[PDB]
């Protein structure tokens, strides 16, 4: 949260107007004697242009800075203009090369009209009373018919999942969610108590429909689940997994949420990967954790961090290490595309909320991954009362997100 | 519109056709639209529309399906916000209920022709034999969108053959604080970049 405060309290503002950048100094007394403006232009995290400009701004003054004509990348993607204020000379309170202010813009998006379809090979499914099985070359996908969720994935001569991929509508209660509510004192207003009364955490998935078909190019399986608490349906989730001839699985998730129910903390897919890689490579807002309510400090770029960095060790265990606006996530052989929010970790959401301290946490077998298309704002103005803003809450009623799951 | 992909397959229960279009201006793609029409065994057609909009481009006024129905019914029955026209920027006065109005009431006769008669938050739309389900915004009228903007006065408008229907899943706020400057609020504008809406088209 400290990088968020730093970005919001920075002494240089920025107003981009096409090619020209405008730097306004919020300094009252000092002239920009030791400032260095550096700007990067990158697509897909790949730098296409960079430049250094000596920042010579007057106090409470605004400086217009023209950038050189930028290259137009034919390769589809989204260009990003990131400027930063660097302090070249050392100071009594900061080292040399210190970054005081930064800002990122979005410009010149190029949509891809390329046709992924179709590979020469064609996936094959085998239908049985027990479950669904789909085979393509070395890879094999299995879909459980009893639950409706895919039970296992395969490679080689190789193994994949440790726990089936299911829909996730809850998160580990934050200190903001808890509020002043205790076991001895029940607080009706708290989000965690509204979610307990609604039965989100104890909602059981009911497979109402499960079908499997083969298109000419790819294999498509359509499923639909429902979460019910005391006879009342909370969420209805409909999914249409598509297994491309290349092996890429495109999961289309359409979720409907009841209006009576308190809005879900997240609308998400979650699973447990048996593989534990040392590094995590992703394209999105980073490098530190960020939420819909708090992501202004985060910068969009290709980020690479160890698995331990992806987990924030709050003394009181809860939801943490979430990265928003992620277009691509590379963990080991696995790869996930599309725009989503993820918080890959060694600790499950059920373990965190049950745990009271961070030292009691034990690293669960394999790796827990929570890919959520939508996530509620964390807040907040105060801890003791619900402080999540209205627009950040998940109150649309219907939600849709599609991610392409592939290997390598 | 440029047809980049068009396929057709038959599932066990229903027939599914997947298509994908692209809108290009001077070599630059503005929107990419992907649709998966599904023809149920009952005859109900479920259209799933996923639209991607470029960031460089100004946000579209609406993301929508539109067509011209050859049939001209006297009444329009719909379940949603009404009975009068309403927009995302202006729908607080509108009340959700089953509304029934003549086709002429669905058109607002502004002296200067433009977009009008839009009903938001509509779950069901019944026009003649046709029926459209799902949550959408519609402004069924006798005048096309191309005719209105070309026309300068309301009296010059001629009722086009059949009926024009614009079912839009998303619509920009109309505004506004003042006329002389852009006054549409940020949240009402269509700036998400990606949009999705699904409507079930059936007869009777």
Q: Is the dihedral of CA A155, A44, A168, A273 positive or negative?
A: positive
Record the resolution, in angstroms. Answer: 2.2
Number of helices and strands (H, E) in chain A?
4, 24
Using a CB-CB cut-off of 8 Å, the residues of chain B touching A111 are 22, 29, 31-32, 52, 54
Q: Is the dihedral of CA A260, A261, A266, A270 positive or negative?
A: negative
Q: ω into residue A118 within 30 of 0, thus cis?
A: yes
Q: How was this one solved?
A: cryo-EM
CB contact under 8 A, B54 and A110: yes
A106 interfacial to chain B (CB closer than 8 Å): yes
Query: How far off is chain B from A175, nearest CA to CA, in Å?
Result: 29
Q: Hey, how many other C-beta atoms are within 10 angstroms of the C-beta on A231?
A: 5
Using a CB-CB cut-off of 8 Å, the residues of chain B touching A391 are 187
3-state secondary structure of A176: helix
Tell me the sheet residues that pair with A369.
Answer: A271
Find, in chain A, the residue whose alpha carbon is nearest to that of B11.
A213
The DSSP H or E segment spanning A195 is helix A191-198
Tokens of A246: 């290349």
Find, in chain B, the residue whose alpha carbon is nearest to that of A396.
B135
The DSSP H or E segment spanning A240 is strand A232-243
3-state secondary structure of A194: helix
Using a CB-CB cut-off of 8 Å, the residues of chain A touching B7 are 117, 215-217
The class of domain A116-408 in CATH terms is mainly beta
How many residues can be counted in chain A?
A: 408
Distances in Å between the alpha carbon of A113 and those of A245, B22, B31? 19, 7, 10
A251, A408 contact by CB (below 8 A): no
CB contact under 8 A, A113 and B4: yes
Q: Hey, how many other C-beta atoms are within 10 angstroms of the C-beta on B199?
A: 19
Find, in chain B, the residue whose alpha carbon is nearest to that of A338.
B194
Find, in chain B, the residue whose alpha carbon is nearest to that of A116.
B5
Distances in Å between the alpha carbon of B40 and those of A219, B12, B46, B74? 19, 10, 8, 29
DSSP string, A277-318: -SEEEEEEEESS--BTTB-SS-EEEEEEEETTTTS---SS--
State the Cα–Cα distance between residues A298 and A294, nearest whole angstrom. 8
Which of B:131-160 have CB within 8 Å of A?
135
In total, the C-beta contacts within 8 angstroms joining chain A to chain B are 43
CB contact under 8 A, A113 and B32: yes
Using a CB-CB cut-off of 8 Å, the residues of chain A touching B13 are 211
Q: In what order do the strands lie in the sheet with A158-159?
A: A124-127, A131-136, A139-144, A150-155, A158-159
Sort residue B175 into left (φ over 0), alpha (ψ -120 to 50) or beta: left
Tokens of A364: 């669960």
Number of helices and strands (H, E) in chain B?
1, 11
CB contact under 8 A, A113 and B22: yes
Tell me the sheet residues that pair with A250.
Answer: A242, A404
Distances in Å between the alpha carbon of A42 and those of A69, A79, A109, A330? 14, 6, 12, 19
3-state secondary structure of B194: strand
Using alpha carbons, select from A375, A179, A371 the residue that is nearest to residue A269: A371
Q: Hey, how many other C-beta atoms are within 10 angstroms of the C-beta on A45?
A: 18
Tokens of A134: 């789909």
Distances in Å between the alpha carbon of A137 and those of A123, A218, A246, A406, B37? 8, 13, 10, 14, 30
State the Cα–Cα distance between residues A221 and A208, nearest whole angstrom. 14
CATH number of A10-115: 2.60.40.10
CB contact under 8 A, B198 and A254: yes
CB contact under 8 A, B11 and A220: yes
Residue with tokens 């979430």: A322
- Breaks in chain A (C to N over 2.5 Å), named by the residue before each, are none
B105 interfacial to chain A (CB closer than 8 Å): no
Using a CB-CB cut-off of 8 Å, the residues of chain A touching B196 are 400
Using a CB-CB cut-off of 8 Å, the residues of chain A touching B135 are 398
State the Cα–Cα distance between residues B162 and B167, nearest whole angstrom. 16
Residue with tokens 């006879």: A231
A337, A404 contact by CB (below 8 A): yes
The residues spanned by each domain of chain A are 10-115, 116-408
3-state secondary structure of A191: helix
A83, A72 contact by CB (below 8 A): no
Query: How far off is chain B from A167, nearest CA to CA, in Å?
Result: 20
Q: Is the dihedral of CA A342, A344, A348, A352 positive or negative?
A: negative
End-to-end CA distance of chain A: 33
A286, A187 contact by CB (below 8 A): no
Q: Report the residue of B8, B26, B37, B54 to disrupt the A interface, i.e. the one with the largest count of A CBs within 10 Å.
A: B54
Using alpha carbons, select from A105, A7, A14, A11 the residue that is nearest to residue A64: A14
Q: ω into residue A380 within 30 of 0, thus cis?
A: yes
CB contact under 8 A, A117 and B29: no
Distances in Å between the alpha carbon of A223 and those of A160, A260, A308, A337, B41? 22, 25, 35, 21, 18
Using alpha carbons, select from A31, A28, A42 the residue that is nearest to residue A84: A42
DSSP string, A47-60: EEEEEEEEE-PPTT
A298 burial class (0-12, 13-18, 19+ CB within 10 angstroms)? Answer: buried
φ/ψ (deg, to 5) at A34: -125, 55
Using alpha carbons, select from A61, A100, A62 the residue that is nearest to residue A83: A100
Distances in Å between the alpha carbon of A86 and those of A10, A101, A195, A227, A256? 12, 8, 45, 51, 47
Using a CB-CB cut-off of 8 Å, the residues of chain B touching A113 are 2, 4, 22, 29, 32
Query: How far off is chain A from B184, nearest CA to CA, in Å?
Result: 18
Does this chain's domain A10-115 share its CATH topology with A116-408? no
A89, A54 contact by CB (below 8 A): no
The class of domain B1-204 in CATH terms is mainly beta
Find, in chain B, the residue whose alpha carbon is nearest to that of A216.
B9
Q: Which residues of B116-125 are buried (b: 16+ CB within 10 A; e: fewer)?
A: bbbbbbbebb
Using alpha carbons, select from A278, A257, A276, A279 the residue that is nearest to residue A266: A257
CB contact under 8 A, A106 and B198: no
CB contact under 8 A, A113 and B2: yes
Tokens of A112: 């891809």
B32 interfacial to chain A (CB closer than 8 Å): yes
Query: How far off is chain A from B191, nearest CA to CA, in Å?
Result: 13
Least CB–CB distance from B4: residue in A115, A217, A398:
A115
Sort residue B44 into left (φ over 0), alpha (ψ -120 to 50) or beta: beta
Binding residues of A for substrate are 384
Q: Is the dihedral of CA A268, A273, A276, A278 positive or negative?
A: negative
Binding residues of A are 384
Find, in chain A, the residue whose alpha carbon is nearest to that of B54.
A109
Q: Hey, how many other C-beta atoms are within 10 angstroms of the C-beta on A119?
A: 15
B29 interfacial to chain A (CB closer than 8 Å): yes
Distances in Å between the alpha carbon of A352 and those of A120, A245, A346, A369, A371? 46, 39, 11, 14, 17
Residue with tokens 């590379």: A330
CB contact under 8 A, A339 and B194: yes
List of residues 6+ apart from A88 with CB closer than 8 A: A34, A36, A96, A97
End-to-end CA distance of chain B: 31
Q: Hey, how many other C-beta atoms are within 10 angstroms of the C-beta on A308?
A: 13
């Amino acid at each position: 949260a400290l990088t968020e405060a730093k970005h919001q309290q920075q002494f240089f503002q920025f107003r981009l107007s096409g090619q020209t950048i405008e730097v306004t100094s919020e300094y009252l007394f000092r002239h920009s004697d030791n400032e260095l403006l550096h700007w990067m232009v990158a697509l897909d995290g790949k730098p296409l242009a960079s430049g250094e400009v000596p920042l010579d701004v007057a106090p409470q003054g605004k400086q217009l800075i023209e950038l050189p004509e930028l290259p137009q990348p034919e390769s589809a993607g989204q260009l990003w203009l990131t400027v930063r204020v660097v302090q070249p000379n050392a100071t009594a309170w900061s080292e040399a090369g210190h970054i005081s202010a930064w800002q990122q813009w979005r410009l010149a998006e190029n949509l891809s009209v390329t046709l992924p379809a179709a590979s020469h090979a064609i996936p094959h499914l085998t239908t049985s009373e027990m479950d669904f099985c789909i085979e393509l070359g070395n890879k094999r996908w299995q879909f459980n018919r009893q639950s409706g969720f895919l039970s296992q994935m395969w490679i080689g001569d190789k193994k994949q999942l440790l726990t089936p991929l299911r829909d996730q509508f809850t998160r580990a209660p934050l200190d903001n969610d808890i509020g002043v509510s205790e076991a001895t004192r029940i607080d009706p207003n708290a989000w965690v108590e509204r979610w307990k009364a609604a039965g989100h955490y104890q909602a059981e998935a009911a497979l109402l429909q499960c079908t499997a078909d083969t298109l000419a190019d790819a294999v498509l399986i359509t499923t639909a689940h429902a979460w019910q608490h005391q006879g009342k349906t909370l969420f209805i989730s409909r999914k249409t997994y598509r297994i491309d001839g290349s092996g890429q699985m495109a999961i289309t998730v359409d979720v409907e949420v009841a209006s009576d129910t308190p809005h879900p903390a997240r609308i998400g897919l979650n699973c447990q990967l048996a593989q534990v890689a040392e590094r995590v490579n992703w394209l999105g807002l980073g490098p530190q954790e960020n939420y819909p309510d708090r992501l202004t400090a985060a910068c969009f770029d290709r980020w690479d961090l160890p698995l331990s960095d992806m987990y924030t060790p709050y003394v009181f265990p809860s939801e943490n290490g979430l990265r928003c606006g992620t277009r691509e996530l590379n963990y080991g052989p696995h790869q996930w595309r599309g725009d989503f929010q993820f918080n890959i970790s060694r600790y499950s959401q059920q373990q965190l909320m049950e745990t009271s301290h961070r030292h009691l946490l034990h690293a669960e077998e394999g790796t827990w991954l929570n890919i959520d298309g939508f996530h509620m704002g964390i807040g907040g103005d105060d801890s003791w009362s619900p402080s999540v803003s209205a627009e950040f809450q998940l109150s649309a009623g219907r939600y849709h997100y599609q991610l392409v799951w592939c290997q390598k």
